Write a protein that binds this DNA or RNA. Structure first.
Ligand code: MG
Ligand code: MG
Ligand code: MG
Ligand code: MG
Ligand code: MG
Ligand code: MG
Ligand code: MG
Ligand code: MG
Ligand code: MG
Ligand code: MG
Ligand code: MG
Ligand code: MG
Ligand code: MG
Ligand code: MG
Ligand code: MG
Ligand code: MG
Ligand code: MG
Ligand code: MG
Ligand code: MG
Ligand code: MG
Ligand code: MG
Ligand code: MG
Ligand code: MG
Ligand code: MG
Ligand code: MG
Ligand code: MG
Ligand code: MG
Ligand code: MG
Ligand code: MG
Ligand code: MG
Ligand code: MG
Ligand code: MG
Ligand code: MG
Ligand code: MG
Ligand code: MG
Ligand code: MG
Ligand code: MG
Ligand code: MG
Ligand code: MG
Ligand code: MG
Ligand code: MG
Ligand code: MG
Ligand code: MG
Ligand code: MG
Ligand code: MG
Ligand code: MG
Ligand code: MG
Ligand code: MG
Ligand code: MG
Ligand code: MG
Ligand code: MG
Ligand code: MG
Ligand code: MG
Ligand code: MG
Ligand code: MG
Ligand code: MG
Ligand code: MG
Ligand code: MG
Ligand code: MG
Ligand code: MG
Ligand code: MG
Ligand code: MG
Ligand code: MG
Ligand code: MG
Ligand code: MG
Ligand code: MG
Ligand code: MG
Ligand code: MG
Ligand code: MG
Ligand code: MG
Ligand code: MG
Ligand code: MG
Ligand code: MG
Ligand code: MG
Ligand code: MG
Ligand code: MG
Ligand code: MG
Ligand code: MG
Ligand code: MG
Ligand code: MG
Ligand code: MG
Ligand code: MG
Ligand code: ZN
Lengths: 140, 5, 37, 174, 204
RNA sequence: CGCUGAAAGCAUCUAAGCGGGAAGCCCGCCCCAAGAUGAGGCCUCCCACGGCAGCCGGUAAGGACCCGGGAAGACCA
RNA sequence: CGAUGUCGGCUCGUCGCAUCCUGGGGCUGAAGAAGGUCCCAAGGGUUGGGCUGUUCGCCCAUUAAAGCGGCACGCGAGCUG
């Protein structure tokens, strides 16, 4: 007998409120859902995880002195092109990148892992435009 | 061609 | 401001305080101001 | 050996109103809100406010004495109010009101005009005496500090803006 | 923030208070408002200006429809002036008064493939003392095994000019409104007959 | 460098909170830039063609080819 | 060692900061002016000549200043020799 492999199913859409949640501990759960390892038919070479919608990403929470000391970094290829942006400056300018960056570093590297990142849709504020897909509110 | 002497 | 690795009281009116993660000596004598560093 | 547990006299008729992390102090001169740790407890008694801490850990002992004074300063602010006096010293140095503003002639090429923020009132009795009056003890001390910095006391001559009661400490220049 | 489209006419100089004033003449007027960008519809504020009337025989149907929605004769050039909401439906040189300071944007003259000396003011090589076929060469472009490569943005030979250049804070010497003429003190990018854009200065 | 202020009846720029403060930092200025595959937005134009998410033609709005050239340019653009 | 071209110069830079200058400070045996000393700060700037192959150094005339270092003592499929 060979191991079961699943046909293609229509994937579940899901919603998570980030407000007051801890950054890394929410990301860890989003990654799992995006990989779809919460499903018993999980298969490592196909995008069959869930689509994850996050509202209130601006209201993510962090411990310690990380608002002023966690430095996101960008290198441009040029002499001196190392850019440092502290967490609060990011939260104040592009607050959704905080949780996107956190989730992306926990996803597999490679083509599939990039596809799975695209199934993540993160919004500052209480609202999201995916009402067409009617995502299911999850608690985590 | 110069030398490594 | 004296900046050194060994900061101590220099006179009896010196005060060792810890502000903002650093050890300072403060004093009515401004020569005695010390920061640890 | 304590400040937190010392109760606060409330004059007639000041009202102290308690709320989550805030106390409101209304009195004859105005209102003040005093943000206070939810780890503390502010207790309204007869003509008296008390503060209690819920442990003997260093943070709770520190917020305790802190919260009590903050409220006591506000109770005093809305009744007696707060003031601080500045003495100008220097041969050509003086100050005058221009409407609500404070104008300092303190030896620069130009005069300095300090304008009063809300709750701050400048009183210039004599050309060498300025008073900063308001209910907020912190704000009054901050504005006063600003004014003094405009021309600090000289290290060598009795010249500049001084606090009242501020000693004159000079050193020899020869 | 006001602006207008124009054409570089040429240089001359005038006399003003017993001084020669180098000027560049610009023909700026008149520019019909063809579309206004609004926060509601476009997310920002700007006025799409027209400039120079065009032979309607050369204006295809997508563009003809665009002019029609404005009731405006077909125009050669469409450029937006950003953050500008003129009152009327036409912009003329009158928006500038003598004494004001303007920013002028044009397309510089194109040097084509340009050497490191013309393009980047490099020193080149010596012309005698044994210099061997390197008189206009750039010299070293790197280090050795560390980093073992050449930086991005490295100054090298390549195309030069025919690029957008803005020269800033130019004095409006005169405005001759009957000819749609603006006179600006100093130099302005590009060749005679080039398209230019005249904005109120951002210098203060 | 301060204000207010405990712990620690005093004191303390600090532990709660608030000010001031560099040619440096972020923005601002100038240029590039949606292959930003996360490929964005606006204005306008054409339009359901014919034959067994595919094919086959003939078309639309448009475009290219070719030509006359150009302070654009190595060719290309 | 079936080869990793070795000094200085030239050219082109780029980085570090233990900072030469310029900006901000504290202390001074800081009157003012000018200095000393330490702290912060790498954004930009950091001259032209005489001698010697020189690196280095000395000298001339200036300068806000005439910094010190890493990059195979940066760079000879870039030049010189
Ligand atoms: Mg099976
Ligand atoms: Mg969580
Ligand atoms: Mg999978
Ligand atoms: Mg999957
Ligand atoms: Mg934090
Ligand atoms: Mg692996
Ligand atoms: Mg000692
Ligand atoms: Mg003391
Ligand atoms: Mg032009
Ligand atoms: Mg243009
Ligand atoms: Mg051109
Ligand atoms: Mg030219
Ligand atoms: Mg050319
Ligand atoms: Mg050249
Ligand atoms: Mg040249
Ligand atoms: Mg050039
Ligand atoms: Mg040369
Ligand atoms: Mg030459
Ligand atoms: Mg020659
Ligand atoms: Mg030779
Ligand atoms: Mg050669
Ligand atoms: Mg030759
Ligand atoms: Mg070369
Ligand atoms: Mg090599
Ligand atoms: Mg080499
Ligand atoms: Mg490398
Ligand atoms: Mg070109
Ligand atoms: Mg340019
Ligand atoms: Mg000028
Ligand atoms: Mg005139
Ligand atoms: Mg005319
Ligand atoms: Mg006290
Ligand atoms: Mg104090
Ligand atoms: Mg604090
Ligand atoms: Mg501050
Ligand atoms: Mg101050
Ligand atoms: Mg552009
Ligand atoms: Mg696109
Ligand atoms: Mg674009
Ligand atoms: Mg894709
Ligand atoms: Mg897509
Ligand atoms: Mg991307
Ligand atoms: Mg898309
Ligand atoms: Mg598009
Ligand atoms: Mg958009
Ligand atoms: Mg084409
Ligand atoms: Mg040609
Ligand atoms: Mg061509
Ligand atoms: Mg050809
Ligand atoms: Mg050709
Ligand atoms: Mg061709
Ligand atoms: Mg060998
Ligand atoms: Mg061999
Ligand atoms: Mg070999
Ligand atoms: Mg060999
Ligand atoms: Mg170097
Ligand atoms: Mg340092
Ligand atoms: Mg300095
Ligand atoms: Mg200084
Ligand atoms: Mg002095
Ligand atoms: Mg002296
Ligand atoms: Mg000093
Ligand atoms: Mg110091
Ligand atoms: Mg620097
Ligand atoms: Mg020299
Ligand atoms: Mg000679
Ligand atoms: Mg020589
Ligand atoms: Mg020498
Ligand atoms: Mg020697
Ligand atoms: Mg000197
Ligand atoms: Mg100097
Ligand atoms: Mg070498
Ligand atoms: Mg060297
Ligand atoms: Mg070499
Ligand atoms: Mg050679
Ligand atoms: Mg050599
Ligand atoms: Mg080599
Ligand atoms: Mg070689
Ligand atoms: Mg080479
Ligand atoms: Mg080689
Ligand atoms: Mg020889
Ligand atoms: Mg020889
Ligand atoms: Zn002392």
């Amino acid at each position: 007998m060979k191991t079961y492999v699943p046909k293609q199913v229509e994937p579940r859409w899901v919603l998570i409120d980030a407000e007051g949640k801890t950054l890394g501990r929410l990301a860890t759960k989003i990654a799992t859902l995006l990989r779809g390892k919460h499903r018993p038919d999980w298969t490592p070479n196909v995008a069959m995880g869930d689509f994850v919608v996050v509202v209130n990403a601006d209201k993510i929470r962090v411990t310690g002195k990380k608002l002023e000391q966690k430095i996101y970094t960008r290198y441009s290829g040029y002499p001196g092109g190392l850019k440092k942006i502290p967490l609060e400056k990011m939260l104040a300018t592009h607050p959704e990148r905080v949780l996107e960056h956190a989730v992306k570093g926990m996803l597999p590297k490679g083509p599939l892992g990039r596809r799975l990142f695209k199934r993540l849709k993160v919004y500052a504020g209480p609202d999201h435009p995916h009402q067409a897909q009617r995502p299911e509110k999850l608690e985590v | 061609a110069a030398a490594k002497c | 401001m004296k900046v050194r690795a060994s900061v101590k009281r220099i006179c009896d009116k010196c005060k060792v305080i810890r502000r903002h993660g650093r050890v300072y000596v403060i004093c009515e004598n401004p020569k005695h101001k010390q920061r640890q560093g | 050996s304590r400040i937190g547990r010392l109760p606060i006299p409330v004059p007639k008729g000041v009202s102290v109103e308690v709320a989550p992390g805030r106390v409101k102090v209304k009195g004859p001169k105005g209102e003040l809100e005093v943000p206070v740790s939810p780890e503390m407890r502010v207790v309204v008694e007869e003509g008296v406010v008390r503060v209690e801490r819920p442990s003997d850990e260093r943070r709770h002992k520190s917020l305790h004495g802190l919260t009590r004074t903050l409220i006591a300063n506000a109770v005093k602010g809305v009744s007696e109010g707060y003031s601080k006096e500045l003495l100008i010293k220097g041969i050509g140095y003086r100050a005058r009101l221009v409407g609500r503003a404070l104008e300092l002639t303190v030896g620069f090429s130009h005069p300095v005009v300090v304008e009063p923020p809300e709750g701050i009132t400048f009183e210039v009795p004599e050309p060498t005496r300025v008073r900063v009056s308001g209910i907020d003890k912190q704000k009054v001390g901050q504005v006063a500090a600003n004014i003094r910095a405009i021309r600090k006391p000289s290290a060598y001559h009795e010249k500049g803006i001084y606090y009242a009661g501020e000693p004159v400490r000079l050193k020899p220049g020869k | 923030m006001k602006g207008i489209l124009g054409v570089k006419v040429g240089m001359t100089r005038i006399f003003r208070d017993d001084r020669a004033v180098p000027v560049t003449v610009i023909l700026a007027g008149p520019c019909p408002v063809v579309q206004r960008r609004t926060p509601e519809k476009d997310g920002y504020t700007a006025v799409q200006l027209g400039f120079l009337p065009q032979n309607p025989k050369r204006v295809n149907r997508p563009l003809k429809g665009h002019f029609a929605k404005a009731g405006v004769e077909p125009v050669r050039i469409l450029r937006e002036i950003r953050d500008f909401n003129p009152e009327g439906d036409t912009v003329t040189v009158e928006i500038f008064k003598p004494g004001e300071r303007v920013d002028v944007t044009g397309t510089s003259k194109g040097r084509g493939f340009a050497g490191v000396m013309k393009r980047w003011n490099f020193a080149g090589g010596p012309d005698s003392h044994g210099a061997h076929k390197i008189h206009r060469h750039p010299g070293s472009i790197g280090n050795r095994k560390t980093p073992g490569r050449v930086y991005k943005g490295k100054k090298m030979a390549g195309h030069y000019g025919a690029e957008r250049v803005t020269v800033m804070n130019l004095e409006v010497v005169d405005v001759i409104p009957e000819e749609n003429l603006l006179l600006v003190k100093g130099a302005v990018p590009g060749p005679n007959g080039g398209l230019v854009i005249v904005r109120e200065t951002k210098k203060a």
